[PDB]
């Protein structure tokens, strides 16, 4: 199969840049009909993919003329020239010229803003949960930037890898920043085994690491 | 005025199929072929076959063996099949008119989003969330409901009849067992709670689940 490869992963912009999304393909890509089937889609959360440039260079209806593609061989890249809210969202590129027809891993456009750490919260379980046989421990990390982040469980100073969900937002319409859930959730039985309970962020922020916890014992 | 329409099942059980009818108005299908595209968080965009105006075909060679693409001229519609679905099948299937020439008929489908399990219609529990008795103050307060073991998608989460709307992260939902968890955090003024009441109102349509709850602080 024809491989696309899309780079950058993320590409984070001010609302006036310019910007430019490269699609790189492990073969040709001209069709047995002479044509360069290779299309560029721009998808917003909850919607379908739309079309913004086909046959490489060529504008769909009602796209904007800040929107080009060029490229040939293996090579193709999309430019867009001054960036507006509407633009932001996640670029694909596809070739349909050779079965099977296949899409690059996507490059998301994202908006810049100042660095802010997550604001580290953690819950311990409700009497509720307990009584019915459950025990999930709840960290949040909220409002934070840039987007990667590092979350650890420890118990009784031992670092917990089982049981451990997350959950990511996407970039807040407001304030531009991320937030995630972290989630450790056990039996009553093996919660009631343990005293101390850590979650813990590591972020590009601080050098150490934020440390939220709390003691069974004043429960 | 160009519509690709989707319906059929959001829900298949583990080895079963998958129908969905694609119903085209705005351009005629003895002239254009049809794509049938999936997208999954493992494998991304997936482009899994075509009819074409004459009523060949071409399949992506991974699905071939379980997958099936027709259609009706005469109602204008395309139909898709797949058999032996799997977990992994979980996906947004769309139908789509792509890699153009010299039309501009390029639109996709609204997409299906296709759950492949065995769970039976669950409604959740909600726990609320609210600090431990040690300590834990500063401005502002974070709280939080958690939304655990329902089936299927969706809730609904809003705070006091939506009256918080700000200062919110509702996560999204992942999987514990065969059941679906999430939580919703919200921060609100110090000073406010626990003077002013705070209630989380989650909603599971599917369950006629509708529940209130109060974040008492705990002691
Ligand atoms: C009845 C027509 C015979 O052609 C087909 C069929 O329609 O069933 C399709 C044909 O596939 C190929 C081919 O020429 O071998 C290759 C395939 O990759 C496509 O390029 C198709 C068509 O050319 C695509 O048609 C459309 C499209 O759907 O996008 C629509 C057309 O109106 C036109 O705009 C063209 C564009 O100008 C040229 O691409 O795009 O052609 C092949 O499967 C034969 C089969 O050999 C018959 O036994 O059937
Ligand atoms: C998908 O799921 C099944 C699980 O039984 C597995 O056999 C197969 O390796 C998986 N393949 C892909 C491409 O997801
Ligand atoms: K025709």
């Known amino acids: 199969d024809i491989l696309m490869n899309q780079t950058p992963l993320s590409l984070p912009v001010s609302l006036g840049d310019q910007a430019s999304i490269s699609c790189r393909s492990s073969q040709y890509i001209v069709h047995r009909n002479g044509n360069t089937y290779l299309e560029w889609y721009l998808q917003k959360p909850g919607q379908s993919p739309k079309l913004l440039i086909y046959?490489?260079?060529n504008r769909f209806s009602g796209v904007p003329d800040r929107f080009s593609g060029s490229g040939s061989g293996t090579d193709f890249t999309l430019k867009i020239s001054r960036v507006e809210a509407e633009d932001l969202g996640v670029y694909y590129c596809?070739?349909?010229?050779?079965?099977?027809?296949?899409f690059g891993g996507g490059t998301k456009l994202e908006l810049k803003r100042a660095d802010a750490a997550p604001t580290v919260s953690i819950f311990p379980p409700s009497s509720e949960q307990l009584t019915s046989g459950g025990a999930s421990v709840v960290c949040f990390l909220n409002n934070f930037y840039p987007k990667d982040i590092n979350v650890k469980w420890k118990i009784d100073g031992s670092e917990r890898q089982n049981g451990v969900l997350n959950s990511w937002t996407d970039q807040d319409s407001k304030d531009s920043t991320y937030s995630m859930s972290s989630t450790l959730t056990l039996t009553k039985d093996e919660y009631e085994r343990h005293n101390s309970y850590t979650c813990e962020a590591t972020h590009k922020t601080s050098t150490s690491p934020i440390v939220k916890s709390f003691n069974r014992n004043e429960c | 005025e160009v519509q690709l329409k989707e319906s059929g099942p959001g829900l298949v059980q583990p080895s079963q199929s998958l129908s969905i009818t694609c119903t085209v108005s705005g351009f005629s299908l003895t002239t254009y072929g049809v794509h049938w595209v999936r997208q999954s968080p493992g494998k991304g965009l997936e482009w899994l076959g075509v009819i074409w105006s004459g009523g060949s075909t071409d399949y992506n060679a991974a699905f071939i063996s379980r997958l099936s693409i027709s259609k009706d001229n005469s109602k204008s519609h395309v139909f898709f099949k797949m058999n032996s679905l799997q977990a992994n099948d979980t996906a947004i299937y769309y139908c789509?008119?792509?890699?153009?020439?010299?039309?501009?008929?390029?639109?996709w489908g609204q997409g299906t989003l296709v759950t492949v399990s065995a769970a039976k219609t669950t409604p959740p529990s909600v726990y609320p969330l609210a600090p431990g008795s040690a300590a834990q103050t500063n401005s502002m307060v974070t709280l939080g409901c958690l939304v655990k073991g329902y089936f299927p998608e969706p809730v609904t989460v809003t705070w006091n009849s939506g009256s918080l709307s700000s200062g919110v992260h509702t996560f999204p939902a992942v999987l514990q067992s065969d059941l679906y968890t999430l939580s919703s955090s919200v921060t609100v003024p110090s000073s406010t709670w626990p003077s002013e009441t705070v209630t989380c109102n989650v909603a599971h349509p599917a369950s006629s689940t509708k529940v209130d709850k109060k974040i008492v602080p705990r002691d």
């Open positions: 046959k490489v260079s």
């Open positions: 789509a008119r792509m890699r153009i020439t010299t039309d501009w008929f390029a639109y």
């Open positions: 596809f070739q349909g010229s050779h079965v099977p027809y296949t």
